Amino acid sequence: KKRWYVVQAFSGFEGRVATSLREHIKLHNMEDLFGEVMVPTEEKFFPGYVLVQMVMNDASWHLVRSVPRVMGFIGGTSDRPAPISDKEVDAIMNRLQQVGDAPRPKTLFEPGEMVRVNDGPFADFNGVVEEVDYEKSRLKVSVSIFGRATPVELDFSQVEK
Amino acid sequence: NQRIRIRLKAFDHRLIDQATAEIVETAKRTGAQVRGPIPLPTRKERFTVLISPHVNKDARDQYEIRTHLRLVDIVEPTEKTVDALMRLDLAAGVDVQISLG
Amino acid sequence: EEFDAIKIALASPDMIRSWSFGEVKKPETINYRTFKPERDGLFCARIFGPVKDYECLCGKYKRLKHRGVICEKCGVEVTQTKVRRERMGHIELASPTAHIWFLKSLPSRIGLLLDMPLRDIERVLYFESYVVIEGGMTNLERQQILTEEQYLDALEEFGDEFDAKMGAEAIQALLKSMDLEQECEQLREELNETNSETKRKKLTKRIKLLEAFVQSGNKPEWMILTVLPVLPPDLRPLVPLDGGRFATSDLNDLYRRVINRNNRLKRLLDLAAPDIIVRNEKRMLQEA
Amino acid sequence: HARSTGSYSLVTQQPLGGKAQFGGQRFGEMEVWALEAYGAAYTLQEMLTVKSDDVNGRTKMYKNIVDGNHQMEPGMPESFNVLLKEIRSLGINIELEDE
Amino acid sequence: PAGTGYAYHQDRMRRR
DNA sequence: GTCCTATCGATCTTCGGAAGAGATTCAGAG
């Protein structure tokens, strides 16, 4: 039975840590002592932690800490580091399984609301609602180009609330 | 990248020309291709009024307001281009309408 | 302001909010092409005040007639730019946090007040062990740090007729637990309970300290931060140098560390991370 | 080198130091003990406020000197207000007090 | 509160 | 080439300061 453990890497080199970890496993051929290696990703939690299905021998512990760009395990102590939990592994796999299905909000662009844009050359500019292109599923938002509050129209996808 | 379309409307033609030229220069300088300055038609709104305070119907004045249009389109808005345009403030009395999308 | 004495004390969280004019949210300072301050970052003109001499950032107002209006294009107040050096903001921390000074002065003011050794509160505060509180119908003491092995023991040798926590919340709870005057009234008698010089004196210290916390207005939980004030931006200016480069202006790298960590910790709290992950970020925040 | 008036630093308004900048000489720590060792109090008050740090008083002083009034309004130095905020930027409530 | 400034603090404290 | 995000979460911070004082750790025993 292989239980889960948490590994800390240099945050930013995490995929390379995962690849080097799989390669160190297939070098030192303790293939019966490692199950998987998880870096979950949403359309990226957790920011710098690598999940490893593993067992605990001191040889495999030295193996994972001899993988480069790995600080160490995170647990109660450094002698016998800590697995996490049954329901916590199940919930992380639940949200990893709820992969897609991530659209946007359903709120309305109230006239007068001060907005910022989401895409385009005018992306992320200090905008303020000027009118309601409602039944178009569209938008129009004031902006400061040429110093005037010029009337500029935006797609509904260009809101930021 | 969708391209920014700009409509200039002014009662004076020289002023509108000045605005359009400045905008074109700014765009063309920042690299993006200005695709204009096309003069759209002028709206000649004519009025005919009685000049007398009371009778005499044939004594009349014909006035007219002439609205000049200029369409300046700029293809692919870049960083330099958008920021330059934003920085540049035009002459007052020239209505600009930035249609994009 | 004219004055004739100076007073110092610990600042309660509501006082620290009172000094604030806004709450900082983003780990940023000024843009990297144009050089406006990025709003709700460490320079946001509507948190602290306007950059231009007596005129506003959004451009809407530029004359003394408007002095003290607040705009609705970006929200800045039009006022003396001089006051940009006067006004503070704050950060709301996603957890309590121990203030390093009171953790590692000459003794520790925390530890001394608790009668708990410095290394052991640090052993809580950097998340190395639990500490047990409200121990109730179980075989456990009043502070008595217990290793995660020894908590996993108590989690089933006992139910929850006790508690133990980890990190700064646990110390905050311990300080909050202080029946402070009653502890002093006892200890000033327990002074007499031996003639042992080798604690009568470091106990004289402890019985002084308790009475000093009593006689001031102070309260012990304030050793622990919760709102962290941020320095008014003109005192830590991000000046440009030779060409388009900002001078590395140290504090703005430190607050940047904090606020990044706090942004992550609010995320991982509300997304409900497991203990080991939050003990990671909570350690990294306290250590920042 | 000599300086009447010119630059001031940003974090605290004391003068710049240098010849490569038009700086004012440091009336450093030991000089202040030297004034205190004469009776000289007004000289010192001036030297470390009106001549130095008090953002109001120095412009009122300058105008009083061109007017030839030979009088000062001394206030309280802005570097000391920097200190207060740098302590109050710790959770340490330091404050001025009245009586 | 020394020297000339003592004499002022003293007068301030005497007219009291 | 530009923009955004993070640090040895798979090492090795220098031995060549003295001091001087305190906080904190241990003797021989009543």
Place this chain on the structure above:
DNA sequence: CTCTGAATCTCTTCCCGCGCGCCGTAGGAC
């Protein structure tokens, strides 16, 4: 069985001015 002696650890301090000289976030990903 821990009470006054002593023993090892860290923290803190080290002149005042002054003038030059230079040197001044990176790495990775899209």
